[PDB]
Amino acid sequence: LNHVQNMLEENLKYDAQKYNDEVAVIQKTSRIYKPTYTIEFNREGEVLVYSADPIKNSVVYFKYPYVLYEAAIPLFIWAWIYNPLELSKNAVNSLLIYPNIAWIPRMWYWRSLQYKIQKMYLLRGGKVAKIETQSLAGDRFTSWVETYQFHPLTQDQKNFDNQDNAEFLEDEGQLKYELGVQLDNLQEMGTTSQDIVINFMKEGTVHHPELFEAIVKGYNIDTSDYVINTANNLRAREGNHNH
Amino acid sequence: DINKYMESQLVNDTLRAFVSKVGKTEPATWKNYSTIYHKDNYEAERVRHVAFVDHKDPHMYHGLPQDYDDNIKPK
Amino acid sequence: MSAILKRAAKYKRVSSILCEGEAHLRDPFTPPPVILKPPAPRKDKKPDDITDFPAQKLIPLPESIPYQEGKYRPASIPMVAGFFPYNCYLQQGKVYSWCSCGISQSGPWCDGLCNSVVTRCRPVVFNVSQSGYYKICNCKFSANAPFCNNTHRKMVRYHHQTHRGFYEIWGAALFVLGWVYMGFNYYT
Amino acid sequence: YELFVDHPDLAQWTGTYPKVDSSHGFPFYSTYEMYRDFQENTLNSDGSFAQWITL
Amino acid sequence: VVFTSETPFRYVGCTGQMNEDDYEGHELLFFLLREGSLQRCMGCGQVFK
Amino acid sequence: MGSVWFRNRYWWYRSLYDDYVAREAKLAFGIAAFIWLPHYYWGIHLNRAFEV
Amino acid sequence: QMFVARQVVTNSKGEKVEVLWNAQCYEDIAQLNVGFAPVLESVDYHWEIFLWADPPIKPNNDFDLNVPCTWFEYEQEWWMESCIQEDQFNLPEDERPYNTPRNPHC
Amino acid sequence: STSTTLGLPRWYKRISYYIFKIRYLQHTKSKMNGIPGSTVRLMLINRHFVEYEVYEK
Amino acid sequence: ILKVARFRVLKMRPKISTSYRPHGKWGDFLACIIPLIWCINILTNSNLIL
Numbered sequence: 001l002n003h004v005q006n007m008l009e010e011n012l013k014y015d016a017q018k019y020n021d022e023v024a025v026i027q028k029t030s031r032i033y034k035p036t037y038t039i040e041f042n043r044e045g046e047v048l049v050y051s052a053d054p055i056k057n058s059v060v061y062f063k064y065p066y067v068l069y070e071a072a073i074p075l076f077i078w079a080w081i082y083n084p085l086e087l088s089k090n091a092v093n094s095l096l097i098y099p100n101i102a103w104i105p106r107m108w109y110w111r112s113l114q115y116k117i118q119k120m121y122l123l124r125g126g127k128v129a130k131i132e133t134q135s136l137a138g139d140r141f142t143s144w145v146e147t148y149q150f151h152p153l154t155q156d157q158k159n160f161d162n163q164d165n166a167e168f169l170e171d172e173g174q175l176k177y178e179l180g181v182q183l184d185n186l187q188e189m190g191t192t193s194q195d196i197v198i199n200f201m202k203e204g205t206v207h208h209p210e211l212f213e214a215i216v217k218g219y220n221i222d223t224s225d226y227v228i229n230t231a232n233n234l235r236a237r238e239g240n241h242n243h
Numbered sequence: 244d245i246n247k248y249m250e251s252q253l254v255n256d257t258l259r260a261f262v263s264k265v266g267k268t269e270p271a272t273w274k275n276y277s278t279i280y281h282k283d284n285y286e287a288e289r290v291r292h293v294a295f296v297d298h299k300d301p302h303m304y305h306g307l308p309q310d311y312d313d314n315i316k317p318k
Numbered sequence: 319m320s321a322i323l324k325r326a327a328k329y330k331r332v333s334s335i336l337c338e339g340e341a342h343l344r345d346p347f348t349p350p351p352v353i354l355k356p357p358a359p360r361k362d363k364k365p366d367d368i369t370d371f372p373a374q375k376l377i378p379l380p381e382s383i384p385y386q387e388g389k390y391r392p393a394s395i396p397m398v399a400g401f402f403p404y405n406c407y408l409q410q411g412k413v414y415s416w417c418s419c420g421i422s423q424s425g426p427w428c429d430g431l432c433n434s435v436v437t438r439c440r441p442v443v444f445n446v447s448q449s450g451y452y453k454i455c456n457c458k459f460s461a462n463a464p465f466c467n468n469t470h471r472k473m474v475r476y477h478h479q480t481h482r483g484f485y486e487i488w489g490a491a492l493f494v495l496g497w498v499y500m501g502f503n504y505y506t
Numbered sequence: 507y508e509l510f511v512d513h514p515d516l517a518q519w520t521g522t523y524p525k526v527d528s529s530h531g532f533p534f535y536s537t538y539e540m541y542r543d544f545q546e547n548t549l550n551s552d553g554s555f556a557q558w559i560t561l
Numbered sequence: 562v563v564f565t566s567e568t569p570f571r572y573v574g575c576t577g578q579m580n581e582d583d584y585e586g587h588e589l590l591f592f593l594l595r596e597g598s599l600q601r602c603m604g605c606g607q608v609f610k
Numbered sequence: 611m612g613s614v615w616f617r618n619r620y621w622w623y624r625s626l627y628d629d630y631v632a633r634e635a636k637l638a639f640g641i642a643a644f645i646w647l648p649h650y651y652w653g654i655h656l657n658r659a660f661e662v
Numbered sequence: 663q664m665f666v667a668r669q670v671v672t673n674s675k676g677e678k679v680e681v682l683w684n685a686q687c688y689e690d691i692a693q694l695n696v697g698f699a700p701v702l703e704s705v706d707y708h709w710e711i712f713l714w715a716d717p718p719i720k721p722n723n724d725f726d727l728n729v730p731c732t733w734f735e736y737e738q739e740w741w742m743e744s745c746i747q748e749d750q751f752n753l754p755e756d757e758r759p760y761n762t763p764r765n766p767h768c
Numbered sequence: 769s770t771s772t773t774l775g776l777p778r779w780y781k782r783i784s785y786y787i788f789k790i791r792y793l794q795h796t797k798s799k800m801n802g803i804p805g806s807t808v809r810l811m812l813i814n815r816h817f818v819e820y821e822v823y824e825k
Numbered sequence: 826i827l828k829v830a831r832f833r834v835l836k837m838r839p840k841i842s843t844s845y846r847p848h849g850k851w852g853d854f855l856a857c858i859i860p861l862i863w864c865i866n867i868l869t870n871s872n873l874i875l
């Protein structure tokens with residue numbers, strides 16, 4: 001097979017070899033942000049930057065068009081039961097396929113509701129961000145992501161917003177609109193996934209707007225001016241209103 | 244022999260503190276000599292002499308190696 | 319970083335305290351918060367150097383805690399032993415070690431499993447000056463621990479309010495309604 | 507205790523635990539493994555259900 | 562202390578801290594106790610020589 | 611409906627199996643509340659046929 | 663496969679001793695990998711499990727000579743407790759009643 | 769053959785769990801040491817097709 | 826089945842099983858209600874036919 005010569009194949013092989021030989025694990029960068037104020041980290045060496053209750057603030061049950069999808073089921077059930085169209089056995093049995101598939105989109109919506117970040121922390125060194133989220137079943141997922149893997153989206157969510165000049169924070173510091181950010185690689189439950197989109201609802205308090213903006217834009221935060229506050233106010237598996 | 248009892252208690256406390264400091268750990272039990280009246284050898288219940296009222300209680304470290312200095316003397 | 323620096327002037331910070339509140343105002347064993355200033359960075363970082371950060375006070379786990387007069391907040395989140403209290407007859411002057419973690423195998427009283435489970439909830443050692451029947455808490459969330467204060471009803475209400483707890487409760491409800499409807503329609 | 511000290515084999519057969527205490531630190535010279543089938547396959551032990559069915 | 566008669570290693574088994582109610586701490590785990598320094602059981606930390 | 615009746619739920623679990631399947635057990639009620647209706651109705655029809 | 667970890671511990675007599683954690687098997691010496699190399703692969707196959715006929719040992723500890731558990735003893739019930747907690751629902755502290763009347767006799 | 773437990777049949781303690789996780793990750797890295805990275809694999813899969821008709825852009 | 830197949834794999838959410846020994850004492854009795862009901866139904870139907 002290799003005896004057959006193709007310039008496109010040769011170019012692909014050359015590109016792969018050159019990439020492998022040139023690009024290394026260690027990549028240089030110059031996008032370092034130095035916050036003006038000193039950062040007060042928690043007893044655990046982390047600083048909270050975002051908090052919200054997406055489950056509390058979102059619609060779960062009566063969400064369009066899932067209500068329409070699930071309200072179409074009784075029509076199919078009645079059609080099968082009463083055979084109003086005088087169909088054959090297989091034809092009428094075909095009507096029961098819908099109820100087995102009409103609830104999937106609501107399941108997907110409920111799953112997506114768990115990707116709304118409940119809390120966000122920045123670790124020491126300004127290179128790692130811990131995102132804590134919760135599902136409708138009470139399962140809590142905490143995942144750590146390197147800051148450079150973030151990419152904000154426009155207000156319409158249909159394109160990537162310019163990292164340098166991104167307008168998603170109000171003048172005082174809060175979010176103008178629910179900000180969507182795509183993580184290039186996210187490790188959730190010990191499994192890595194590609195191009196994971198997450199959202200920060202506008203109905204959520206934003207702490208340290210400078211740090212939040214730096215994390216969203218992908219800068220590395222300089223935490224040289226840091227202080228440690230010893231406050232053991234948070235217990236393991238602490239309850240919250242995000243249920 | 245109250246004097247003998249108190250002397251034995253003090254000696255056991257000093258020995259426990261010295262051993263804890265040497266091993267960079269804390270005593271496993273505060274019983275001077277193991278006895279089976281209390282089933283501490285094979286049950287969760289322990290015998291630890293560590294009691295205090297609040298975070299600013301001076302008796303917080305009593306019975307622990309932190310109450311002795313590098314010379315093995317009470318602070 | 320020019321845009322971030324420009325907007326930093328008008329950016330404002332918000333407090334990082336949430337529904338959990340402050341533990342030092344509700345737990346006698348939690349010291350008030352204190353800010354520690356790191357020393358200057360080391361010019362030379364030896365491979366075998368130790369931290370120069372100022373030491374933080376170490377508070378060991380007490381064997382037992384006294385009775386908080388209606389101001390009890392468990393150190394950790396205890397296991398919910400039960401959703402209604404135990405009507406126990408207590409003797410006058412007898413010391414009782416009420417279980418806080420909630421996994422005790424001896425009932426409301428401490429059995430020692432607190433030492434075997436990973437928790438900061440320690441048994442509450444208390445005494446009663448008048449013998450008689452008392453309702454001892456089982457959910458381990460009562461503010462008047464070891465005595466029940468009807469906090470189990472609010473815990474049940476919160477469980478019903480939760481999305482999954484609502485589903486579980488009403489699924490069991492409809493499961494029993496299945497038996498009820500079968501009995502109702504038994505004759506046809 | 508008399509049975510254990512005098513006739514260790516019969517004590518083991520009956521299922522009695524070693525009745526001597528080695529708190530002094532020197533293990534006893536006639537210790538034996540525990541045969542607890544009689545006390546375990548009983549209505550009051552882990553074999554409670556099997557013994558109920560057998561009864 | 563586990564004794565051997567001029568042999569380098571011995572197949573040892575551990576069940577953890579023994580209690581009167583159950584007589585066994587943890588499920589039996591077998592390892593090869595070898596001559597030399599002290600060794601430890603992962604489950605319960607028991608030290609063998 | 612099970613462990614709720616017991617004021618020592620940890621003891622309930624330990625003395626039953628020392629295993630925890632309560633989540634699945636209590637989630638299964640919702641599905642079991644309706645998974646039986648067609649079978650029950652067809653059984654009613656079959657019982658009527660037997661009576662006839 | 664010989665030792666899964668090692669540590670250096672100063673005993674009560676002031677001497678530092680090395681403690682090695684042997685690889686273990688679930689009650690099955692047949693599944694146990696008997697090797698003499700720092701290798702996970704099961705390379706050595708032995709026709710005679712006991713070459714010198716020396717019997718193995720399953721020591722039984724005397725309850726009198728036992729010591730209170732201290733090897734992470736606080737973790738014994740952690741698995742079951744955390745399994746229950748994962749599904750347990752915790753009332754928020756702010757909504758949880760506080761500063762209720764004291765018991766008259768306590 | 770290689771034992772799946774890696775010498776740790778039971779994770780009775782978090783220290784044992786950490787040891788198993790470390791050794792398991794190291795073994796997985798060693799076993800994956802001979803295959804291309806994610807970026808290389810993805811680009812190869814994306815640009816595998818080389819059969820076109822007209823050229824010169 | 827769904828829970829085990831979705832979360833109990835090493836990749837997703839392994840759990841550190843620290844329990845040493847079982848402690849069940851009457852779980853067998855509690856479980857045997859269902860086979861008990863099976864036996865009762867079998868006996869009733871068989872005796873009614875007999």
Ligand SMILES: CCCCCCCCCCCCCCCCCC(=O)OC[C@H](COP(=O)([O-])OCC(O)COP(=O)([O-])OC[C@@H](COC(=O)CCCCCCCCCCCCCCCCC)OC(=O)CCCCCCCCCCCCCCCCC)OC(=O)CCCCCCCCCCCCCCCCC
Pocket residue numbers: 069072097100101102104105106108
């Ligand atoms: C002019 C005429 C009059 C007007 C007409 C128009 C009126 C207006 C219409 C408006 C609506 C238009 C359509 C909207 C689509 C919305 C899609 C959606 O939900 O996306 C959001 C949401 C987004 O989630 P996501 O994660 O972002 O992306 C989706 C993922 O890819 C996740 O995808 P996936 O990997 O899951 O794959 C998709 C699909 C599984 O993948 C597929 O099925 C692929 C699609 C092709 C399947 C068919 C293969 C070809 C052969 C078929 C024929 C065989 C011969 C016939 C006999 C045998 C039949 C078996 O998923 C499943 O169903 C998985 C579970 C399997 C079902 C369980 C039951 C199994 C047994 C029965 C079904 C067997 C299979 C289907 C058979 C269908 C034919 C009978 O998507 C989903 O939730 C996935 C799809 C869920 C079902 C969609 C359909 C719902 C019903 C729509 C119609 C409602 C109105 C009905 C009445 C109409 C007349 C009045």
Ligand SMILES: CCCCCCCCCCCCCCCCCC(=O)OC[C@H](COP(=O)([O-])OCC(O)COP(=O)([O-])OC[C@@H](COC(=O)CCCCCCCCCCCCCCCCC)OC(=O)CCCCCCCCCCCCCCCCC)OC(=O)CCCCCCCCCCCCCCCCC
Pocket residue numbers: 400401402403470471474611614615
């Ligand atoms: C067609 C239908 C249409 C319906 C349409 C819609 C209607 C909408 C209605 C909306 C409102 C519904 C409300 C539902 C509530 C559900 C939630 C709930 O209760 O849980 C909160 C509950 C909070 O409890 P709590 O209110 O704070 O009370 C805690 C106290 O420790 C509890 O202790 P205590 O202080 O209450 O003490 C009880 C008793 C303790 O003494 C005993 O040992 C009880 C028996 C004494 C002798 C009585 C002789 C008569 C025959 C008794 C037969 C049963 C006894 C069994 C004893 C077994 C002992 C091993 O006290 C004594 O020392 C003896 C006093 C005897 C005086 C005699 C009075 C006259 C006769 C009646 C006596 C009844 C006694 C209570 C029986 C309770 C069940 C066993 O949360 C939990 O912890 C849940 C635990 C698990 C509950 C499972 C059961 C759920 C259902 C309960 C409601 C039943 C409603 C049935 C209605 C049926 C209508 C068709």
Ligand SMILES: CCCCCCCCCCCCCCCCCC(=O)OC[C@H](COP(=O)([O-])OCC(O)COP(=O)([O-])OC[C@@H](COC(=O)CCCCCCCCCCCCCCCCC)OC(=O)CCCCCCCCCCCCCCCCC)OC(=O)CCCCCCCCCCCCCCCCC
Pocket residue numbers: 402403404405406615
């Ligand atoms: C010549 C004479 C011949 C005589 C022949 C014999 C007589 C006939 C047979 C009698 C059989 C008796 C069986 C029970 C043994 C009681 C042992 C005892 O005294 O324990 C001492 C025990 C410890 O004493 P202590 O340490 O001094 O503590 C005293 C404190 O006051 C303790 O207060 P506490 O607050 O700490 O706790 C008390 C109570 C407080 O908490 C509770 O009440 C627990 C459960 C409810 C919690 C939520 C509260 C809110 C309201 C809930 C409403 C639930 C409704 C749904 C109930 C289930 C569905 C029907 O909690 C419990 O007792 C826990 C039980 C949990 C399981 C309950 C399940 C009951 C299933 C059977 C229901 C049958 C309904 C029949 C209805 C008929 C009319 C329509 O004290 C008690 O149990 C107190 C009650 C005394 C016994 C009353 C028995 C009443 C009759 C029961 C009949 C059962 C059905 C028939 C079976 C046999 C024939 C087929």
Ligand SMILES: CCCCCCCCCCCCCCCCCC(=O)OC[C@H](COP(=O)([O-])OCC(O)COP(=O)([O-])OC[C@@H](COC(=O)CCCCCCCCCCCCCCCCC)OC(=O)CCCCCCCCCCCCCCCCC)OC(=O)CCCCCCCCCCCCCCCCC
Pocket residue numbers: 543544545547548549550557560561
């Ligand atoms: C009637 C037939 C008469 C035939 C006469 C023949 C005369 C010539 C004999 C020549 C042969 C002599 C040697 C016999 C050896 C048999 C094989 C054997 O095992 O040897 C081991 C022997 C050594 O091997 P090994 O493995 O070291 O043996 C270990 C032991 O065997 C230990 O074995 P393991 O570890 O399997 O131990 C099991 C044992 C261990 O568990 C126990 O400790 C038993 C439970 C004790 C506690 C129970 C507490 C219950 C609660 C309290 C009571 C509640 C009730 C209410 C009252 C109290 C109220 C408060 O538990 C059980 O399986 C026993 C059942 C317990 C249920 C109790 C129910 C009581 C209710 C009362 C009515 C029913 C009673 C049934 C009998 C019960 C048992 C005596 O083998 C050899 O030396 C090599 C083979 C030699 C073969 C020789 C030829 C044999 C020929 C046999 C011919 C039989 C013909 C008739 C057959 C059909 C009869 C119906």
Ligand SMILES: CCCCCCCCCCCCCCCCCC(=O)OC[C@H](COP(=O)([O-])OCC(O)COP(=O)([O-])OC[C@@H](COC(=O)CCCCCCCCCCCCCCCCC)OC(=O)CCCCCCCCCCCCCCCCC)OC(=O)CCCCCCCCCCCCCCCCC
Pocket residue numbers: 401474475477478486487488490491492494495611612613614626630631632633634635636638855856857858859
């Ligand atoms: C292999 C592949 C092939 C397979 C082939 C097919 C398979 C073949 C298999 C063959 C082998 C079979 C083997 C069978 C044995 C297997 C055993 C095993 O593995 O599992 C061990 C498993 C271990 O136990 P577990 O399940 O983990 O224990 C947890 C409980 O079971 C869980 O229950 P829970 O109660 O602890 O948790 C739920 C709890 C959660 O809730 C709470 O605890 C919260 C507190 C309670 C109150 C909550 C509400 C409060 C509301 C406050 C007010 C709100 C605002 C006001 C709003 C309304 C007013 C405006 O809910 C409640 O307590 C409240 C529910 C109340 C609903 C009932 C009321 C009915 C009436 C309602 C009427 C309403 C409409 C009126 C209409 C009127 C007119 C028509 O089961 C066993 O222990 C062994 C069972 C053996 C058989 C005996 C069964 C009975 C004994 C109890 C257990 C029963 C459930 C479990 C049965 C097992 C299946 C689900």
Ligand SMILES: CCCCCCCCCCCCCCCCCC(=O)OC[C@H](COP(=O)([O-])OCC[N+](C)(C)C)OC(=O)CCCCCCCCCCCCCCCCC
Pocket residue numbers: 475478479480481484488492495
């Ligand atoms: C000729 C034509 C005739 C047509 C007739 C049509 C009749 C229509 C009747 C509709 C009845 C609706 C009942 C549910 C009402 C809920 C109200 C509400 O929001 O309450 C919140 C309140 C608030 O509760 P809460 O705040 O404590 O916690 C729940 C809160 N959420 C859900 C947001 C997390 O809930 C309650 O207090 C309970 C109310 C009753 C709930 C009943 C649940 C039924 C589940 C059914 C499942 C599917 C099977 C259905 C068929 C079988 C039924 C037995």
Ligand SMILES: CCCCCCCCCCCCCCCCCC(=O)OC[C@H](COP(=O)([O-])OCC[N+](C)(C)C)OC(=O)CCCCCCCCCCCCCCCCC
Pocket residue numbers: 423424425611612613615616617618619621622
């Ligand atoms: C399918 C339809 C429903 C069928 C229901 C069938 C059950 C009917 C009632 C049976 C009562 C006798 C049960 C004997 C076994 C348990 C004994 C025991 O542990 O008691 C001590 C316990 C005490 O538990 P405790 O936790 O408070 O204390 C024990 C802990 N130590 C040892 C540390 C002190 O008392 C009870 O809680 C009794 C509960 C009785 C109900 C059955 C419990 C099993 C689960 C099923 C619940 C079904 C409710 C049905 C209501 C009535 C319907 C008519």
Ligand code: FES
Pocket residue numbers: 416417418419420421422423428429430431432433439440441442
């Ligand atoms: S406090 Fe619950 S066991 Fe000691």
Ligand code: FES
Pocket residue numbers: 400401402403454455456457458459460465466467468469470471
């Ligand atoms: S049982 Fe805890 S408050 Fe009533």
Ligand SMILES: [Zn+2]
Pocket residue numbers: 575576577587602603604605606607
């Ligand atoms: Zn061991």
